[model samples]
Target: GGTTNKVTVYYKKGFNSPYIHYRPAGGSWTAAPGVKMQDAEISGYAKITVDIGSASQLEAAFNDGNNNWDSNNTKNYLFSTGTSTYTPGSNGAAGTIRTGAPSG
Candidate 1:
């Protein structure tokens, strides 16, 4: 479901199929693998818009349908009700996080 209060998470294209695992702050989690992300307007990104009404914060992580994951070094990614981009890490480096949606 979608909401007026939502968080759009854009993940840089990498994995075969990216999924967004997220939950509202102090709330229960979605089942494993979470929600599938769609292709972003940008050439190298996939995005998912989550419904988060009234909640002030959200905890998010990325994963492929397989087992690969981007957990931000176990801390997971964090954001409020808005747009953000996440670039998954490579070669043991931590992923990068940024605010604002990509214009593409």
Candidate 2:
């Protein structure tokens, strides 16, 4: 069975993937609705909303047209709150944590 991830943006090479599909608990990987506009650098991003059971089940994949996800690496470039209790396989040398609990 293929893997499906449900989240806002799946950040990968160069930092992210803004378009893709998500599979529910018993559903197939269905594409979400949105459009992308970018150039040499990300000049803009899509605003998408998705429903999930928990943040732990979330993931980030990488790909261009032929999606290539590193199913091996369990770490993330940023964010480590809810999924903190799980395995953080590996990440960037100077990674940043954008998941710190905040009211700001």
Candidate 3:
């Protein structure tokens, strides 16, 4: 049981400062390590990456500073499903979720 999976968050330019959170499949939400979306070409959005241990599923969500730093209204975000995995820069046809490697 080691950190084998990582998570990241991005949002449409100019949403509230997001307090990104993540958890293992069905686990409670915890604060994920965040970082500035490091790209000169990018603007308006912020990004953060968190390392996750062995978990079958990874979930993420965001709160625009208005809500609790640890809670939000957006349903927890899911990036992986079935056998398919999510990758960085993965522009899923939804609320901008990018996913990567897993422990399960």
Candidate 4:
């Protein structure tokens, strides 16, 4: 039997570009989001460990653009678990968190 899961990674206020990469159990690390943004969404199996990173570097890529964005603030990343039978948001409202595996 297999379980489904969802992982979300987002940046704090001030930061501009944000991204994440995740590698499943015994799998190679792949880019979660190709581009940088405020947030990113991903879904996969439960047996996975996600690795979050900045749009620039993996350790701690901070904003260093011409606008002089806030590069000191730390980013926030989170992971959640759900089921395959669950549906996404609807009617302009957000969807309820599915109950299956414990939330990470």
Of the candidates shown, which would achieve the greatest lDDT relative to the real structure?
A: 1
Best by TM-score: 1
RMSD of each: 3.2, 8.9, 7.7, 12.4
Q: Where does candidate 4 stray beyond 4 Å?
A: 32-104
Which pairs clash inside model 1? none
Q: Give the backbone clash total of model 2.
A: 1
C-alpha RMSD in Å of predicted model 2 compared with the true structure = 8.9
TM-score of 1: 0.80
Q: Check candidate 2 and list the clashing pairs.
A: 11-16
The regions of model 1 sitting more than 4 angstroms off are 1-4, 91-93
Candidate 2 Cα misplacement greater than 4 A, ranges: 1-18, 25-27, 31-47, 53-56, 72-97, 100-104
Candidate 2 lDDT at 9 equals: 37
TM-score of 2: 0.32
Clashes of 4: 0
- How much is 49 displaced in model 1, in angstroms? 0.8
Question: In candidate 3, what are the lDDT values of residues 1-104, reduced to their tens digit?
Answer: 65576544444444334444566676755644433232222454344455556664666654445644422235655654332222223244434443432232
User: Local error of candidate 1 at 72, Å?
Assistant: 1.6
Q: Candidate 3: which stretches are off by over 4 Å?
A: 1-3, 31-41, 67-74, 80-104
Q: Which candidate, 1 or 3, has the higher lDDT?
A: 1
